[PDB]
């Protein structure tokens, strides 16, 4: 049963957004895909049949990122309007507007407990917010250039952030202190970071066509994934764990790349988008990928593999 390669095949193309898509994310309960776009809208789609479910509106400018709560009932979105918004998915209503960043909000996530939201912004700060009250609990002077990604680890006790300043930092959620600064070589911009599913590693993209897997604690690079194009955009990357253990990323050559996590060999390339694939997401229980593309494409594609 150990796989050798996936066989992702296109099942659905989801059109509706009227500007570039920025981020796609599967709900933790597997039922839904949420997408955000430069068109200022969130759209919710059925994860299994591509069925359009609803549009969620209210931001005054484009959205760069969206993230789900652990129970699949809330979304948080990060917008160029300098705010985040917390949304009730069932109703589509804005429950809270998280005000405090002084420039575009670029990235966001809930902690696993989903009592906190973390955000990163072009204002070069990382902010930690109380879900219940909408209060900003902490502002971290995390970076000296825009923050490209923020992510909680599996127990919520750590946050990893990345920035165009070239750093990846690991923060103690409770205290706000930097536990560790991952710095490497001439330090190109770090355009994306997230924790591995088990919390021991950090997957980081740099704007030199490189993904790297790092043991944060040991400060050592374990794996490097190359062969794609990423020199401009903050492209999401994923750990695929439902079948074969893959790394997934979009690319500026309009393809989805899939690598063997262990061997670093490319195991599949998905063709079909007609612009930069800015975002990919991996379904939490099924071998399903979502991909989304920029202005000349504006579609979301759903792909299925047997492994």
């Amino acid at each position: 049963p150990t796989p050798v390669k996936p066989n992702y095949a296109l099942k659905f193309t989801l059109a509706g957004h009227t500007k570039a898509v920025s981020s796609v994310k599967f709900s933790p309960n597997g039922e839904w895909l949420a997408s955000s776009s430069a068109d200022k809208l969130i759209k919710i789609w059925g994860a299994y049949d591509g069925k359009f479910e609803k549009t969620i509106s209210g931001h005054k400018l484009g959205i760069s990122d969206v993230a789900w709560s652990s129970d699949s009932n809330l979304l948080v979105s990060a917008s160029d309007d300098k705010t985040l918004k917390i949304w009730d998915v069932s109703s589509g209503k804005c429950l809270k507007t998280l005000k405090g960043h002084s420039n575009y909000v670029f990235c966001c996530n809930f902690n696993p407990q989903s009592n906190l939201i973390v955000s990163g912004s072009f204002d070069e700060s990382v902010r930690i917010w109380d879900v219940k009250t909408g209060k900003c609990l902490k502002t971290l002077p995390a970076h000296s250039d825009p923050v490209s990604a923020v992510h909680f680890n599996r127990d919520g006790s750590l946050i990893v952030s990345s920035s165009y300043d070239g750093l990846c930092r690991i923060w103690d959620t409770a205290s706000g202190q930097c536990l560790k600064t991952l710095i490497d070589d001439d330090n190109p911009p770090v355009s994306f970071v997230k924790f591995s599913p088990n919390g021991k590693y950090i997957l980081a993209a740099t704007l030199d066509n490189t993904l790297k897997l790092w043991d944060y604690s040991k400060g050592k690079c374990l794996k490097t994934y190359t062969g794609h194009k990423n020199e401009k955009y903050c492209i999401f990357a994923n750990f695929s764990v439902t079948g074969g253990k893959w790394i997934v990323s979009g690319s500026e050559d309009n393809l989805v790349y899939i690598w063997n996590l262990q061997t670093k060999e490319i195991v599949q390339k998905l063709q079909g988008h007609t612009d930069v694939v800015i975002s990919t997401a991996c379904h939490p229980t099924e071998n399903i990928i979502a991909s989304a593309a920029l202005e000349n494409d504006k579609t979301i594609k759903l792909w299925k593999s047997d492994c």
């Binding site: 920025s22 484009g62 670029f106 955009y233 202005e295």
Partner: peptide
């Protein structure tokens, strides 16, 4: 419209 990520 625009988003910083899609620009």
């Amino acid at each position: 419209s625009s988003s910083r990520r899609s620009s």
